[PDB]
Amino acid sequence: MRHPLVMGNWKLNGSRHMVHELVSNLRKELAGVAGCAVAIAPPEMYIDMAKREAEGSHIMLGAQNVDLNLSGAFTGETSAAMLKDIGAQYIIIGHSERRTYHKESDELIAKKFAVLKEQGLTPVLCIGETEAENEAGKTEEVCARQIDAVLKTQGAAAFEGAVIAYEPVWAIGTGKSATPAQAQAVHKFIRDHIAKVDANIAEQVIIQYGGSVNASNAAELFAQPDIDGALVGGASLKADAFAVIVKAAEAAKQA
Amino acid sequence: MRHPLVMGNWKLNGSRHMVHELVSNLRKELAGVAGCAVAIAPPEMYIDMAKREAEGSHIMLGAQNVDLNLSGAFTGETSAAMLKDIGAQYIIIGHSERRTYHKESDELIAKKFAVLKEQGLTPVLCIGETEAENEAGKTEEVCARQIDAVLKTQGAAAFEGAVIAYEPVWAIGTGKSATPAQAQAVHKFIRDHIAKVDANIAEQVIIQYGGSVNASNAAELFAQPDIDGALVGGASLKADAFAVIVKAAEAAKQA
Ligand code: NA
């Protein structure tokens, strides 16, 4: 009975022309969708415009990162209070691109998670193992560590309403890809890990697949029982492709 | 002969309500000002809104930071192309809060400067020495090093149309204060340093004072020949206190 969520991570892509075109096309392609929740995370300067463009549709807003302070003398930072104020709900934290390029630690990401919960925002907690970690047979240990930074400091209750996105980092720019069976094995492990602390919370947590998802492979991934949607990368930038993914999630999970 | 510039760095302060109120009040308080340029840098998510509220005023927009990529798979980053697209003109880079809290190196800041120049945006390059550096008599050495990261890698023409903001970190909220004579000595040094590579570029660079400016010292600071305005922190959150600084800059250079 978990209602799927398909979220578009636009990454560093956007312009006022593009926001209008893409959100308008998304509204049209998604106007008949009932069985899947949808969120988009444009670059921070476009959240307000995208929110305005999405008014009248069921498309929810989000953001790609957040910092730790709500206000103060912190030049260039992003406030959870302001993200809430501007209309963002689903906030991506711990994306592999930020863990790598910006050295964001497990502990820092758990702190972001806490700030978001205090604001009534929905963290989209990204976790996943690297190529070296995967080769060492560490997939489970790494996912557990990343989840534990939150679970062991804030309890299972912190995952009520939250979203986890599993990114097999080892499949990024390596030519490789995870199969739906491989993806499912990891999602079931993540859910079982949380279940060790609170089985009820585990059953309600939305676990999205964050590896490569496109119009072609969405159906096979969403047929898996512990895959509750996707955090979509490149396919998020074209309304037609993104819509096929949303409809595939709808079809896979509907009664 | 340099037209002064007073810029408000809002830091991590802003909301929908505060943007509407502050921008409206600023336009009212700045009525009749023509001899001093004015820019504001709200948190990134509010730049678009602030620009719209600024319509009908002479207030120019800006931002508090930028990253190095224009587009791509860089979740949570800020693109200079998008800042330009959203209407931000004056982009603060290398602020002491980012050099310290986010460990931004001289080299990284110089790369930000380059991306801004490539896009045709105006960098507001912040430089300045710490408490210890000041006590050790290293003010000039530090300022030269921070400027050289750009000057020696990009050439003196990089500073055509650019802004430099000198922040006396050693004196900002520390119990010690910089006199106008002391600020003037640093500004003159900065301009002389650039002049060693290109005298014509040096004479057109806008060098703002970034230390504590209030109504009581604005007149004496702005009477100094090498001080072309100020990068204002806390006072930029109150229309009346910010306008007093702008009017002092106008009055001083029209004296
Ligand atoms: Na930022």
**Which positions ≥6 away from A12 have C-beta within 8 Å?**
A43, B69, B70, B71, B72, B73, B74, B75, B77, B79
End-to-end CA distance of chain B: 12
Q: Which of A46, A72, A97 sits opposite B74 (nearest CB)?
A: A97
Residues that place a CB less than 5 A from ion ligand 1: A 76
What is the number of residues in chain A?
255
**Which positions ≥6 away from A204 have C-beta within 8 Å?**
A2, A160
Distance, in Å, from the CA atom of A4 to the CA atom of A229, rounded to the nearest integer, reads: 5
**CA distance to A76, B12, B66, B80, per residue, from B63 (Å):** 8, 11, 8, 10
For B161: left if phi > 0, alpha if psi spans -120 to 50, otherwise beta; the answer is left
Nearest CA in chain B to A172: B73
Packed helices A106-118 and A139-154: angle between N→C axes, nearest 10 degrees:
40
Alpha-carbon Rg of chain A, whole angstroms? 17
Nearest C-alpha neighbor of B87 from the set B42, B125, B135, B130: B42
Q: How many CA atoms lie within 13 A of B115 on its CB side?
A: 23
Nearest C-alpha neighbor of A253 from the set A37, A31, A9: A37
Q: Which two tokens stand for residue A201?
A: 């919370």
Distance, in Å, from the CA atom of B240 to the CA atom of A123, rounded to the nearest integer, reads: 39
The set of catalytic residues of B is 95, 167
Nearest C-alpha neighbor of A75 from the set B208, B147, B99: B99
**What resolution in angstroms, rounded to 1 decimal?**
1.8
Q: Which domain holds residue A113?
A: 1-255
The domain that contains B134 carries what CATH number?
3.20.20.70
Nearest C-alpha neighbor of B245 from the set B225, B219, B223, B224: B219
- CA A245 to chain B, closest CA, distance in angstroms equals 20
Q: Give the DSSP per-residue string, A216-242.
A: TTHHHHHTSTT--EEEESGGGGSHHHH
Nearest CA in chain A to B80: A12
Q: Which two tokens stand for residue A36?
A: 């899947």
Q: Position B245: which residue type?
A: I
Q: How many domains does chain B have?
A: 1
**Which positions ≥6 away from A159 have C-beta within 8 Å?**
A150, A151, A194, A201, A202, A205
**Which positions ≥6 away from A188 have C-beta within 8 Å?**
A225, A226
Active site residue A167: yes
What is the number of residues in chain B?
255
